[PDB]
Amino acid sequence: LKEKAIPKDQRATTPYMTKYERARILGTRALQISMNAPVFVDLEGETDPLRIAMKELAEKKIPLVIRRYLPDGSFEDWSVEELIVDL
Amino acid sequence: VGQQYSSAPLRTVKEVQFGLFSPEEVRAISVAKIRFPETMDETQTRAKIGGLNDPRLGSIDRNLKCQTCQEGMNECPGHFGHIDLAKPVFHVGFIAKIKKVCECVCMHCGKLLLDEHNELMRQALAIKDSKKRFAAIWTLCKTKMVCETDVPSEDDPTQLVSRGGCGNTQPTIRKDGLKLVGSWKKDPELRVLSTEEILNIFKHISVKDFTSLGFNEVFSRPEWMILTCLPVPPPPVRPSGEDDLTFKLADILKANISLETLEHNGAPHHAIEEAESLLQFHVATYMDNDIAGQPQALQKSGRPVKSIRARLKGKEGRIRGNLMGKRVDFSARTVISGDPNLELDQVGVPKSIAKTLTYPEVVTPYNIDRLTQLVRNGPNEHPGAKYVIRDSGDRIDLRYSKRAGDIQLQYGWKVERHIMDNDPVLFNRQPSLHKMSMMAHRVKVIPYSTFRLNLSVTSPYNADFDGDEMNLHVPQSEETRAELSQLCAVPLQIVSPQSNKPCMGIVQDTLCGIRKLTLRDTFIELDQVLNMLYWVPDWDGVIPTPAIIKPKPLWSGKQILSVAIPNGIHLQRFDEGTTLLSPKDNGMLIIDGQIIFGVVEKKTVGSSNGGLIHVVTREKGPQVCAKLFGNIQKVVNFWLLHNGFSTGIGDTIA
Amino acid sequence: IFVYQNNITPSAMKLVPSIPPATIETFNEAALVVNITHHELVPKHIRLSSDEKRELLKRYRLKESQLPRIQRADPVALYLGLKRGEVVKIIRKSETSGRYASYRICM
Amino acid sequence: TXPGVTXPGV
Amino acid sequence: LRFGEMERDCMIAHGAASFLKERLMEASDAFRVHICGICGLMTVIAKLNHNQFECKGCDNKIDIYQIHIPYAAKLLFQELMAMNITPRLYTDRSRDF
Amino acid sequence: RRRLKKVEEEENAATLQLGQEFQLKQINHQGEEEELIALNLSEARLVIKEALVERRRAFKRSETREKELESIDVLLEQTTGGNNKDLKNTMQYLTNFSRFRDQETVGAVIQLLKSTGLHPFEVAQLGSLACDTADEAKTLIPSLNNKISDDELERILKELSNLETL
Amino acid sequence: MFFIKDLSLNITLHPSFFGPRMKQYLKTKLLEEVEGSCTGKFGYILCVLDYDNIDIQRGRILPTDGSAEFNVKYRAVVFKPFKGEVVDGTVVSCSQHGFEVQVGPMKVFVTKHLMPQDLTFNAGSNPPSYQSSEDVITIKSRIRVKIEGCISQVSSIHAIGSIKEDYLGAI
Amino acid sequence: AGRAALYKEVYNVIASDGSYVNYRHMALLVDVMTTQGGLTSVTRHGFNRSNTGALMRCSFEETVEILFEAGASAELDDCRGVSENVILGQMAPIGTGAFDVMIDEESLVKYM
Amino acid sequence: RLVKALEDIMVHYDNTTRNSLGNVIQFIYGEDGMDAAHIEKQSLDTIGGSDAAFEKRYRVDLLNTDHTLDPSLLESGSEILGDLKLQVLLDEEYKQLVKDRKFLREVFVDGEANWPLPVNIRRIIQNAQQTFHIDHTKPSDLTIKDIVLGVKDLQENLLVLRGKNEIIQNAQRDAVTLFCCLLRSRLATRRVLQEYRLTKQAFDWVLSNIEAQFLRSVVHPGEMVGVLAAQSIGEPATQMKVTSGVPRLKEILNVAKNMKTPSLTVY
DNA sequence: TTTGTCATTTTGCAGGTACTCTTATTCAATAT
RNA sequence: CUAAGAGUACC
DNA sequence: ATATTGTGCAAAATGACAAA
Ligand SMILES: [Mg+2]
Ligand SMILES: [Zn+2]
Ligand SMILES: [Zn+2]
Ligand SMILES: [Zn+2]
């Protein structure tokens, strides 16, 4: 599993978050918020888990990492903080 | 209640390994030996011990538990039995394969005919994949009809190197019905290759020899292609009026008992051979009733027996009818009707359909109040809740529970409530050729029996309102809801990857009305202008200066339409013969959201590349493009309502 | 390379594989009247070296079978003298991007 | 063909 | 309503894998079945209340896993088993990608 | 392999077939291979004591037989909780049959057996079995039969008994 | 015998538990679950080494569930009895069939068929013991036993020991 | 050149009636058809004769024969295909499933 | 049939297009790595026109007068004339444009100028012109060195493949060559200073938005392009001397040795 | 002798959803 | 129930 | 008196002839 993990200094994948990655992060975070996860962003009164997760992603307070699997089984760990939500 | 808690670790299937049952594995896994063809005992009220419906294989009644696992019918996967075959029979699907394998292997010594000494055999054995190896080995060893106990020396064809050959004559093997006939070359002599001798010769194939034939040493050995023990599937596979498979297994048991009695009592070889062929036929038709050439096994009612192969194959089989495509819950289907007043991403859902389709909302401190209110409302009005799922899995039906009083919601429970406004729902029209034919809409609960959708979105669905039915699916988890809203949303599907151009556009009344409104003749007075401006929801609130101030304040249609067009949009299309002046008012020039010139028609607001829809969705985003759709439709439909359009017989008269 | 007029007797075809590493390639004149690599449907085929093939497999993380296949009877493969396991780079004038590079492994 | 209009063949 | 093959294909094109899984499992047929890590067959007697898992033949009791598969998948596997074909389901990789 | 059902030789310490997962070399959590070090009663006791005191210090920041029994009971109740009846029993067993006292004794023992360079199972068994006669130990451990000389095992047991304290 | 070995445990955490103390929760749940447990693959697991930084790794969220699956890799001390292994212990009880000896955390039952005939059960002496012509085996007495048979029982590993062989008994 | 001619034929079929499809779709089709060194039919005697997994091969055509052949050859299905995970009812390695989401303890502590 | 054949094709995180077996179908999706929805038809201005029109549109000479520029077009219009370093920059820019012209004529034999490319440069130019209120009379603030270096840096900043080895870098250059030809055709010194009359901030904003839009047009790994392609081919067929329509599509998918109308074209 | 090489024979079925209705269960001689 | 059949709706 | 059994085609394959 050491060989599987590509070191962080030579990740060759896009630093931008994909639409599928954004969708899965939002769904995962909304499900966690619905099941009483701690909220890391201050609430402006909103109650919808999906928009809570959207606000969390806007200011990068989602504590998740994407394990992107290369076809050979190697993976790269991209933290949600360092990913760029352009779309 | 679903399935109760199991301490076993929960994994996902990473690999699926195929193979054949060894007879000893069949005997080791089977929890009962089936000997009596009868399904019910003489009392006609219980399942007979040792019959085809043994309680050890699974309970045929909901009342009683399975005798093996002591679990209900909901939990019991069904445990296999075994029928001990008096004489081996061919597996019908493998007969051809068997015919190949026995044609690659000496029928006496059980060794592969052409070893590595033959020239083309290094090439054949060097093939990587199993199927191609077997094909090459077979197409080379089928033409060799002698075991060749002595082969030419590899170094030189002068001395002879002896391998482990016996030198017997390999017959020519053909298939008649469900058996194999071998004609030995005349030293022809024809006799039926008995299954017992074929099994014996398959058991003598060396590990190296049958691993070079594509067979695995652990998962699929060639001698497992001959059936010596039949695994009896549990009653779940053949639920009860007995199933076709139950009657076929009864026939197999009857033939097995007949052959056993004939062998025990002693009989002419003709009766023994006939009983053996009958047992083989029953096994084969149990596994495959569509054997070419042979007559079908007819059921009690004179119809062909439903074999296992029939249950698997076809459109309505297991794979294509219950696994690739299956009937799903939380789905609705009804007639669609048009609604110009609904947003592009909005769909009108009948109030009864909303009252039936339910979404589970996790009870959270953030939404405890509204969930409590919905539980108070109940399932008889919208909005409301239909079920309350407890953390233990127990389910409280809002019907029949109002007697007990108010239910105190606890965090972590689920309130399965009627779908409300702004809920993402998948919306489909079948056949649904492309991905745009299945898109995520927002619910708008309406009081009539038809689905209501925007007119533009009917174009990607290929939907009319001449009785067309459409399907609605409700996601039941936050993850599916979120990925539906962020991936399958109608605004995100505006630009089609199919032709890198928008798939939705202005259609039908709105297109004609926008052409009529943007003509230079169209001048709108103050009152109609105010009404049209108010109909644009995102209108900034400032009344544009009229195009004509004296002697009467008049606004042109382009000026009012440009209010819907978002600020900062530049479009410049030159039609045939158009100039910077537009004598014909063709082409299009929009500068900063204001229509400088051009009649707005299909080439501008339709589903075209470089049109207003494409430019707006590429410049301001999909949400702004959908809002543009709504605003343009609203303003143009109001103007066309108060201007009028028709067609008559006089329109066809020159 | 043996260039023949009409055909090679099958009795002579069997002895075509000589002692390795020598390889005998037989070509018909009729098939070589018109060069196939000058057709515009035919892109540019460049044989890769073993070092280049190793680098290509390392960088793309590929196994031998995962590369696109080219038969060892294809007219271009015979033209360039491909042997099994050798990878050819294909330079193609694509219309989405100006230049596209493919890699095909001989079978 | 097809089916319809197996294969050919099979 | 029939969530047909080409509806599944449209969902695959949308990239909504979780929605497709929810349609095929939670909405239509979800079945928890016990297998063992020695033989992938589902011949695992699981007395859940007694917390006793036993695969006869393999003679193992501490190498049992549970998998969520559609009941149609279980029926297909059991019909394949009745047809002398073993669909061994394993929860780990024996070959690298 | 993934053989359906398993056929293997029965485990036996005498024949040095300790098991497929008790081999000489094991892959550590760092991914490399290290020799499977086997701990005798004294060295294992010291290792357990070190782990327990480290856990006690982490929780805080976040010798005679009877006094040792009292100390281990108090420490077990402190750093650990319930379901330690087995742990209490084995700690009491180690306290009773403790062949060496402190870090110095067990360190000298482990370095001397490192100079001996025999099987980790065998050396830890020798450190656990306070045998007296060398041929007696050979009979006790069939894994030592026809492997080590009589006099060398006798003398190393002599230095082990010299390092034997209390 | 006592060894130290590399083990891994899969722990499932509810979404509600991902507070700033997730590492402490995982460490707490690894304890009380594997500390002092008994499995057939590794025998008795008694304690865990290197508690300061237990390798917890990242932790994968189960799809459509939300819970996290952590593959915690740790070093654990194990006591796996082996066939034909000589080990010391202390006697704890006696009976007609034999006597039980406390070896580590487990009880080993040496049967009266495995004792010499002169060594006979004696109930007149209190507590009942086993007395021979040369030595007596009493409660809380040291004795070495050679385990020759271990029957794999997950709830509590049971082993068959003997003192029949030469130099097997009281030291 | 066969792939180029195939793309031209498919493009002519699509664009004969004035319709337009982006180059990448037809290019993907023709590349799939010519990835094996020869013209692979979209029929059962071409794309379903590829060792791409028994379960996803059986969902198209000749289901039971494919199962029988896979059992005889003891094929290993690595469950990388979409149809395998559809049949087994698990998240396919597609779209949202083409990666794994994991929780970072250090980032979670770092936020507070 | 088409959907089943292509159901396992996916774009992976190394931008390669692979099936379930891991076999590479395309080393980059669509041979350009761009999402189809982010593609618009744009005109390649270098391939079209005549040599004289091409020179007048692109060639700028700081020494002679046949193709000189108006000094009033930019601020330091009187100091650039006679310069040698800036002349070297112009020389390499025009040489690159001529190379691009030859390349584009090679790629498209018919000289078709309107092709689908990801980022609409024209719309960005128009938006910058409207946002910064180009008065089209004041001399431009841009320096020619700024134009050339900014175009080169923007080309270096258009990343489709993020690898750090020769193979991945070469693949990136091959993947972006056509878009770079379009970019050099649009953002040329003469065109920027004369036809569009950018300013310094307007030019920098144009560069930034081109980079952002190109990075946004890149295909997202995890995209199920096989099913998308199968549906995008099958659905137009539902709207459908030489066989065409459904029979020809089936003769193409069903690779048949004998077809209804075998025709051969000789030039 | 083979060793491929050229004339008979051997297979395997029809898109997607959805609605309603109607009919039907081997017929009859024979032993218990 | 089940199987079969027929007739429809929109593609 | 009731249950029991009497319409649109190319792959493969395969024997009955020639090349060595
Ligand atoms: Mg219609
Ligand atoms: Zn059961
Ligand atoms: Zn033989
Ligand atoms: Zn098993």
Coordinates of C-alpha atoms in Angstrom, one line a residue, chain B residues 66 104 378 413 437 487 578 619:
Chain B
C66 CA -36.1 -23.0 8.1
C104 CA -7.8 -33.7 -27.1
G378 CA -50.3 12.9 8.7
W413 CA -34.9 8.8 13.4
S437 CA -34.2 12.3 -21.7
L487 CA -25.2 16.4 -11.9
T578 CA -27.8 41.9 -43.8
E619 CA -21.1 33.5 -20.2

